[PDB]
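Input:
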Amino acid sequence: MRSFLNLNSIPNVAAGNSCSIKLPIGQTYEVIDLRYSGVTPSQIKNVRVELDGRLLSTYKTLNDLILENTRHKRKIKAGVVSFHFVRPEMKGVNVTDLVQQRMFALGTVGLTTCEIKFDIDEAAAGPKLSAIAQKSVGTAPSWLTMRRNFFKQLNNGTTEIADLPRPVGYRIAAIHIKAAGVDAVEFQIDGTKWRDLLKKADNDYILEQYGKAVLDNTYTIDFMLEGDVYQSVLLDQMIQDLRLKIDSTMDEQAEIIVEYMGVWSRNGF
Amino acid sequence: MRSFLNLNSIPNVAAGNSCSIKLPIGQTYEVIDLRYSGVTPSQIKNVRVELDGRLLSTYKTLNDLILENTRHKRKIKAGVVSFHFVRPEMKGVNVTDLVQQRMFALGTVGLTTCEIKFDIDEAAAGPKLSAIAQKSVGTAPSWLTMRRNFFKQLNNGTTEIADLPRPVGYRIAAIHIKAAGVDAVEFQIDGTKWRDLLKKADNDYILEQYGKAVLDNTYTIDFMLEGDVYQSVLLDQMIQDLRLKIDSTMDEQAEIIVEYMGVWSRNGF
Amino acid sequence: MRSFLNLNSIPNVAAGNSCSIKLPIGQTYEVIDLRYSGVTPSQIKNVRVELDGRLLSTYKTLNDLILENTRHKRKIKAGVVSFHFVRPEMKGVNVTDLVQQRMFALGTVGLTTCEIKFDIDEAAAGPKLSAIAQKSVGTAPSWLTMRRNFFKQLNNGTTEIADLPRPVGYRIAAIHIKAAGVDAVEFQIDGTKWRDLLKKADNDYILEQYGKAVLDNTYTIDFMLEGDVYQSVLLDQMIQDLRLKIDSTMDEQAEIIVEYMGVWSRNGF
Ligand SMILES: [Ca+2]
Ligand SMILES: [Ca+2]
Ligand SMILES: [Ca+2]
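Output:
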């Protein structure tokens, strides 16, 4: 049996303020529903999910969480944005789908602090935020999704990005290139071309082919289209080159979103 | 291999008549498609599913079966209403999804009588009813869904309902509060608040979050949102208090629908 | 990890030409995305999937592949048509859904030639065709879907078709009767009526009930509505009669599509 709780009131919710959603340790957080009003998702900046003071996932703005859910075609409602720790799209290969989905839940056992920090923009009309938690029996943090932010400049022609962090033992579920002039992209590991120079229209067709929604000004490289976690990129230590070849038509700075995965560690990624 | 059969003609289908769909014993009924015309679903009153003369499930009107299917976002077609014994939304935890869904099928082995009784309203224009059965190999009644009806007066303020039947060994998949002025509800068992006083808007958001459709003038407490049968309320013999705290804005009569579950017994619930 | 490749250019793509998509042997083809322009799907005739020179699946026109995907409610996009070897609708009974779906992938190991032949109509405006492959680790051809074409005369009244090929050990996933005047159909094996004389409206309701789309001028007999491969017709070497009783209202020649299934054999069906 799951428990639906109305989280404690968020302290000091005001424009230009730096607030935090301190989660009580002990149980597992499958989903966290954040209700907002008097402020836009884009006005909720620097969203960070921290476990024991260490960064887990980061969102430039709350709007990126809305887009993250939209991509998987999850239920979107105005005035509310959810933090889906449990991945509903997961499919089991040697275990049930339910087990594969719940494995991403935010367990808090052994944790000292679980927080969701963010800053309220100064222009916020009259910010009002509350949260509801869909919890289950306690478990260790364990397997978690680690959304990381990276900013790289793009040229008009070809741009190569090979300096992406490769935490050993971790995996890469997907890579999102946020740019308005990306025509085609190619992904390779150690010379091996896992993703040919696919045109945007072709890449976007495959995405939609798997029930995903194409995000505006974004080139998504989904490594878990089938929902199989073992299809994701395994950051094996012996890997010598993890490269991305981007064919752009504009000279701009792109925001590269990398969805990492791995067993959460006190001293890990 | 399944068998699709055109059930025998329904005897005496006329306005103001009391008809019955007598099902032949021997096999398993996964789904029963009831075609209707010259009558409205609301004109088909007191729908009772009886096994060996005992009541299994009850519907005030056929319209409640239409709403039951609509809630799960099942295919709805005008002129036809189906009895989904097999629950398509079920997900397996230690077994396959298919096994978890088919486990609810209406097995008839060992039964003496299997009937679907109902009364045709007098205002019925020109009632015409036929049925089709989607069957499979015979099995005992076994695990079945037992829809029960309850009527309780709801006040403007706070009302508490703790006298709901607690058949030992049985489970509760969901509870539907049919009232027009329900603002928030709270569910608890033995003091433990499994469902905080959740506002309708918040409760309805979680429901939709799991692919469910919100029913008009209804507050649904779904204990199987994930499709996992083990998330439902297990009516343990030791439970001392099963309470519901309803915050209404109107003084009215609510129809409380309780979806029970358990292994069918000739002398059980 | 899967590999998305831009297949080699299709040789001699012109109106009235006979082209072929020669697939490199070694890996497994889960899906093949065929992009087309300057030609209609109906202008791409006699589509044949050949393994070692032998016929596996056949499509009168590329439009039949579009309808095949539409029926399962797969993502349809103008200018592109995919060959879904892996069946996304598959559900596991004693194995995971993923295993049951991927089991249909087009493995090429041990093969000498893998081709997708077709003829470009003479009326083609300015045909332009390219292909992309979603591949995975190599496997033998193994379990494959074998779409077969049959033409039979339907009468206005009742027609019976009992001369359908019954390859031993193979299965039948579905049968599609392409005719404009089919009212009802009945399916039986050895006298046993597995599908009663179901009216089109009733048959089509069950189809939609399982997330399928009804095709125009087609009576589909889906034996895998639940996604369970074990629900399909097992062509037992002991079946004496496999009959189809069609109640038509027109006198026309129907195109009977039979989706066979079985482990591909160099000297088999
Ligand atoms: Ca976890
Ligand atoms: Ca049962
Ligand atoms: Ca295969």
